[PDB]
Design a protein around this ligand. Structure first.
Ligand code: HEM
Ligand code: NA
Length: 250
């Protein structure tokens, strides 16, 4: 992994464990798992490996970053978490948001993504424009996930599977509707829907469709559609990597 995780105090570790439980209950009750996953992903996805800037360091709560067009509708997520965060003053926002992402996947029935504490809250949000454009294709996905974040082609396909929960909103991105018939259930249905073609009532972004036509991405879509266990394994790996971009050296 190339990771050396920092030491945190026993009190910090206790807070992580307690916050994890409180997050399960809150996220399940509020039905906001997909929104919390999006919040964690948009926090982390700004990492640029060349300059070591952006990444999961608490900056998404900053008015300046929330205002990024890619982040439309995430102000809600930040507000929803503020009362719970206030119960855990010892935790960084950085850790709290990544923990919420991990919990979002868990409570919707997804894999248990390993979590290591210690991210510091950094003062400077990254510049706008690093998050992917839903209207573009495979070259663009590699620029963003590969050239900037430093994730693999496998990670790209697995992480796209995060769309197995949630929906787009015409008031946020402009796109509208869920990718799956069960948007609060984490499973491999995203890939199965991708393969079956356009079904009325279900969403496919151009960026999703790009996975089907790329020589490297397509076999991965096929694998995940055929084998949910393989999806969960590769997803857990990718999510952990994403949640740790720029953190614990690397
Ligand atoms: C591959 C490039 C990606 C593109 C172009 C993209 C684009 C989008 C767009 C346009 C929306 C709709 C936002 C709205 O209108 O509410 C969305 C929602 C969402 N995204 Fe992605 N995304 C990508 C990757 C990811 C990744 C890597 C994850 C996490 C692993 C993720 C998780 C989600 C979730 C859970 C939602 C639903 C949010 C909700 O229900 O409110 N996406 N994405
Ligand atoms: Na689903």
């Amino acid at each position: 992994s190339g990771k050396s995780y920092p030491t945190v105090s026993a009190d910090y570790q206790k807070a992580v464990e307690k916050a994890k439980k409180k997050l399960r209950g809150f996220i399940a009750e509020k039905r906001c798992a997909p929104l919390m996953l999006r919040l964690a992903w948009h926090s982390a996805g700004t990492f640029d490996k060349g300059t070591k800037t952006g990444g999961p360091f608490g900056t998404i709560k900053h008015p300046a970053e929330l205002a990024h067009s890619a982040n439309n509708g995430l102000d809600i997520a930040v507000r929803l978490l503020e009362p719970l965060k206030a119960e855990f003053p010892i935790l960084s926002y950085a850790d709290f948001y990544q923990l919420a992402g991990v919990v979002a996947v868990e409570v919707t029935g997804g894999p248990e993504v390993p979590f290591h504490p210690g991210r510091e809250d950094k003062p400077e949000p990254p510049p706008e424009g690093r998050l992917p454009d839903a209207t573009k294709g495979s070259d663009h996905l590699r620029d963003v996930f590969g050239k900037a974040m430093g994730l693999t082609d496998q990670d790209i396909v697995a992480l796209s599977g995060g769309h197995t929960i949630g929906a787009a909103h015409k008031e946020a991105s402009g796109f509208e509707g869920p990718w799956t018939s069960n948007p609060l259930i984490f499973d491999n249905s995203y890939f199965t829907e991708l393969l079956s073609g356009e079904k009325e009532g279900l969403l496919q972004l151009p960026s999703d469709k790009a996975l089907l036509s790329d020589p490297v991405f397509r076999p991965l879509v096929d694998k995940y559609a055929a084998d949910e266990d393989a999806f969960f394994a590769d997803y857990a790996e990718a999510h952990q990597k994403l949640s740790e971009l720029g953190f614990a050296d690397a």
